[PDB]
Design a protein around this ligand. Structure first.
Ligand SMILES: Cc1cc2nc3c(=O)[nH]c(=O)nc-3n(C[C@H](O)[C@H](O)[C@H](O)COP(=O)(O)OP(=O)(O)OC[C@H]3O[C@@H](n4cnc5c(N)ncnc54)[C@H](O)[C@@H]3O)c2cc1C
Ligand SMILES: Cc1cc2nc3c(=O)[nH]c(=O)nc-3n(C[C@H](O)[C@H](O)[C@H](O)COP(=O)(O)OP(=O)(O)OC[C@H]3O[C@@H](n4cnc5c(N)ncnc54)[C@H](O)[C@@H]3O)c2cc1C
Ligand SMILES: Cc1cc2nc3c(=O)[nH]c(=O)nc-3n(C[C@H](O)[C@H](O)[C@H](O)COP(=O)(O)OP(=O)(O)OC[C@H]3O[C@@H](n4cnc5c(N)ncnc54)[C@H](O)[C@@H]3O)c2cc1C
Ligand SMILES: NC(=O)c1ccc[n+]([C@@H]2O[C@H](COP(=O)([O-])OP(=O)(O)OC[C@H]3O[C@@H](n4cnc5c(N)ncnc54)[C@H](O)[C@@H]3O)[C@@H](O)[C@H]2O)c1
Ligand SMILES: Cc1cc2nc3c(=O)[nH]c(=O)nc-3n(C[C@H](O)[C@H](O)[C@H](O)COP(=O)(O)O)c2cc1C
Ligand SMILES: Nc1ncnc2c1ncn2[C@@H]1O[C@H](COP(=O)(O)OP(=O)(O)O)[C@@H](O)[C@H]1O
Ligand SMILES: [Cl-]
Lengths: 459, 462
């Protein structure tokens, strides 16, 4: 059974399915191959499940009266959680979203193939299923195979040691949990478990949590971990398990300690999926363990494109989707299609961190003289009505023309400011534009206007 | 005891204090006068208290398992609430914020006098306190006296009949509450009480609730009112109270029932404060009950300005703040750089309603040919993870050039999208701009992008 198409997309994740949909809507014959389930990591074992379990944990924290309910005059009595049912609810959401994706692919004229794909050459792929074996030819090959968790060499995945995947579908809650990695995945999940009554410890090699973000921005997250009772082991590397199932931890000076645990989450990073499916035959230029690409997602081989996590950092769903749309547009012969100067991100810890564009340090590294100003939520009315006064909002702008080049915010319930950050950046707003924009009262968003004005005050 | 300044501000509400602060920062000698408490209505008996109580109610609803906690595998035991302590908590927030306004006024070089201010003439004022009085001359007079609740003459305030003020400082929760008027104030407070276990009935003269918003936008609020248990008496006028303390209501055809009540909230509107402080002398033109002003907040008298609620609709704090800031800047000599921007608004009912710019009806009334599209939260991944799938985001844009002229949204926890809506309108975004802007996943915000593409799809259709 020999087949042919114009665009062959390997991987049914955000990058892949969004790319295929747009392609189909543009009239490009397209075939999408997916070994597991449509939606990839993002829907099945990443974004949605984590955000779903974060909602359960926040809801359980509040029910327990651990989110300051007493101060409001609400005297509570201990609730109970059936984690299996929490996970089943989360799975229901994932079910509804996958079908929606599947139906959207159908409506766009894309033919989905359920199978494991092996690349034979730049314009030929073998798709293997339960007994099937078809060979598909193509004009364009779009690689969007994503990524997988990085396994610690001294402590592999199995038994008590798990990845984010199993952490998102627990059958039971453990008494003690040790998390390796104070990145956004390890902390988001670490906090989920802590709010659910689990004794949680985090092990990070860097001098502080969330090393990818600057110091000022992370401080309110550190404080929160302190109040929540999460034990932090900063400047410590994991050497492996001992006989009693405890995690051996080594400090900078050399002296070691062991943290007991009946469950260990390793969240040290993510590795691009480039091995095991004949990608060797193409011999594509590499950028670390990821496929090298130019700013239009083209690889070193003509008509072989790469998007999403398989094309490196930043490993975000919206970035993969935006990249996929750009590729579909190019194949359809459309010009003027560029990736934006700034990609927003939200880290769903408590408090949350939201960023778009440059931080003050990123602005100095790029050789641009910039001023910045922040406004604390401690002086924002809305924040006080929500009992969420920690954190702040920061604006970053060029000193010469006041063009905004970055936004950062840390606080509870600040995630939805992300849209204001990326849209203002996409429009090229200046401090004066924001300073002059009337913001609804009372809102957390008012802090954006105040930050801009404060930057114009000590300008 | 005669004293002098350049700018004399009557009222320490959002308009007055923001104006005095700005003016002070710009080096203008300023005197602000407040008869009661700094922060005005917004901080002491309006914006903040209502949002605070809405937080308490939401916390209680959630503690009781009335917001779908069972579906998340969480089994709860019923909580109890000490409402006096809820009010004390709220008054604490209010008090902290008022002292913040006080400290900022001092740090800005403003001289704050506590007392009743009376107009002698356009350039002179009298500030009276307990055994103290001063005549103060000014070059510019800023009137920012605010608003007051409208009292039904056929059911005056007293005893069981309360205004928003007492409803925001209850000593006890009533068994049955009747709310008159289904405006944003009446519904916000109606919902607070209902979530706290009170039987609530709302009486409204208009055909539906929140009559100032379009039907499609308020439909999810009416559905939520039904889910919550709030009884709605639509197309009904409140006549008065019978001997039993019940509310006598009259339908359109003439028929009439009585709603048993042990507490009645009258939220039929708000009125500008223009009487009892010497304004009559100044023959200032009037816009209905309010003071008439041009787009720069100038009254018909020279160097007499008016801002905020005393200057009519829309009665919102951020508008008052904007106007107060504009006035200070004009007196300082700085010309205006941005034209009066769109005035957003957030209705904190459950679900919430957020709006900025024009709705499809407003656009047609202004004579601008527009199209619009919506995207439901029922299809949004973030919304599903938050158990907030009712509602939608709608974008409104000009058919000729795709410039967005308005945004509306209805859903649980959509208030913070206000920044995005307000900032995009001020920048002049087109459907294309939003459509091609990356939005973080997973967020409610992604619906804005999806809505813009929906609309753009129609605009570019054969
Ligand atoms: C716990 C966790 C939380 C996260 N939270 C967020 C968040 O809040 N926001 C955010 O933006 N990002 C988040 N991410 C990252 C996000 O999931 C990824 O950036 C996104 O999934 C990348 O999409 P993709 O299409 O590039 O790859 P993937 O989503 O991994 O899709 C790749 C797909 O291709 C298939 N595939 C691979 N090789 C083959 C082959 N040879 N043949 C056939 N099929 C193949 C796989 O089965 C897979 O389904 C999170 C990740 C994790 C692990
Ligand atoms: C229940 C409720 C909820 C609300 N919620 C919101 C909301 O969520 N968002 C929003 O934007 N708006 C809201 N508002 C509206 C908001 O409170 C008003 O729009 C805002 O307070 C108007 O500000 P202002 O400065 O015009 O007048 P005010 O805030 O009323 O301040 C006027 C001040 O002037 C003083 N004063 C009057 N006469 C004299 C005199 N002769 N001498 C000295 N002092 C004097 C008064 O004591 C008062 O302090 C709400 C209102 C109510 C009633
Ligand atoms: C039936 C009726 C008669 C009126 N008569 C007079 C008058 O004689 N003199 C005068 O100066 N002004 C009168 N008004 C105007 C009133 O005092 C307010 O100024 C006006 O309702 C403000 O409405 P709004 O658009 O600002 O809505 P909001 O202030 O946002 O909300 C107030 C809501 O209360 C409702 N409402 C008002 N009165 C009643 C009532 N009796 N029963 C149930 N609901 C009610 C309104 O329909 C409105 O939806 C009347 C209004 C109504 C509806
Ligand atoms: N006693 C009741 O339970 C009752 C009776 C009628 C209507 N309603 C309510 O009013 C709404 C409209 O129903 P409809 O089309 O049959 O009536 P309608 O629109 O024809 O008018 C309402 C009439 O029913 C009477 N009434 C009695 N209880 C009422 C209540 N709780 N709310 C409003 N009106 C009430 C009024 O006197 C009025 O004449 C419904 O949503 C319903 O919940 C309730
Ligand atoms: C300032 C003002 C506001 C009023 N607001 C209302 C109102 O909201 N609803 C209403 O039914 N009647 C309102 N009325 C009038 C009442 O219908 C009143 O019962 C009727 O006009 C009789 O007035 P009288 O007692 O002066 O004769 C208002 C009157 C005034 C002066
Ligand atoms: N390939 C790898 N092998 C072993 N350890 C790794 C690897 N990649 C990263 N780490 C470890 O992970 C820790 C950093 O984790 P984290 O800050 O969570 O990163 P990320 O945010 O990328 O997940 C460090 O201790 C680092 O040494
Ligand atoms: Cl696009």
């Amino acid at each position: 059974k020999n087949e042919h198409t114009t665009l062959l997309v390997i991987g049914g994740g955000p990058g892949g399915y969004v790319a295929a949909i747009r392609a189909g809507q543009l009239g490009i014959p397209t075939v999408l191959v997916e070994r597991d389930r449509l939606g990839g990591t993002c829907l099945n074992i990443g974004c949605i499940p984590s955000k779903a379990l974060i909602h359960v944990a926040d809801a359980f924290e509040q029910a327990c009266g651990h989110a300051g309910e007493g101060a409001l005059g609400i005297r509570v009595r201990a609730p109970e959680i059936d984690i299996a049912k929490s996970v089943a609810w989360k799975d229901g959401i994932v079910d509804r979203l996958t079908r929606g994706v599947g139906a959207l692919l159908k409506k766009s004229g894309v033919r989905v193939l359920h199978g494991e794909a092996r690349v034979i050459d730049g314009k030929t792929v073998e798709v293997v299923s339960a007994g099937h074996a078809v060979r598909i030819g193509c004009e364009h090959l779009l690689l969007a195979t994503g990524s997988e968790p990085v396994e610690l060499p001294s402590m592999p995945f199995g038994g008590h040691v798990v990845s984010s995947t199993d952490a998102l579908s627990p059958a039971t809650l453990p008494k003690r949990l040790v998390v390796v990695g104070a990145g956004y995945i390890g902390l988001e999940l670490g906090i989920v478990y802590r709010k659910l009554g689990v004794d949680v410890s985090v092990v990070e090699a860097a001098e502080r949590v969330l090393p990818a973000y600057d110091a000022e921005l992370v401080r309110p997250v550190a404080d929160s971990l302190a109040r929540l009772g999460v034990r932090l082991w900063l400047g410590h590397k994991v050497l492996g398990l001992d006989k009693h199932g405890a995690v051996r931890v080594q400090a900078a000076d050399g002296a070691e300690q062991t943290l007991p645990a009946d469950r260990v989450l390793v969240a040290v990073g993510r590795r691009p999926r480039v091995d095991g499916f004949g990608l060797e035959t193409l011999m594509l230029d590499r950028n670390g363990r990821a496929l090298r690409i130019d700013d239009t997602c083209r690889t070193s081989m003509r008509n072989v494109w790469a998007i999403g996590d398989v094309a490196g950092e930043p490993m975000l769903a919206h970035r993969a989707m935006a990249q996929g749309e750009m590729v579909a547009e190019l194949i359809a012969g459309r010009r003027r299609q560029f990736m934006p100067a700034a990609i927003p991100a939200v880290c769903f810890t408590d408090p949350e961190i939201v960023t778009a564009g440059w931080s003050p340090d990123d602005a100095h590294a790029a050789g641009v003289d910039c001023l910045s100003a922040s406004f604390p939520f401690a002086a924002n009315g809305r924040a006080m009505t929500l009992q969420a006064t920690d954190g702040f909002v920061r604006v970053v702008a060029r000193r010469d023309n006041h063009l905004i080049v970055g936004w950062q915010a840390v606080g509870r319930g600040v995630s939805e400011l992300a849209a204001a950050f990326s849209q203002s950046l996409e429009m090229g707003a200046r401090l004066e534009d924001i300073g002059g924009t009337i913001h609804a009262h009372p809102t957390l968003g008012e802090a954006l206007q105040e930050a801009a004005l404060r930057a114009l005050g000590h300008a």
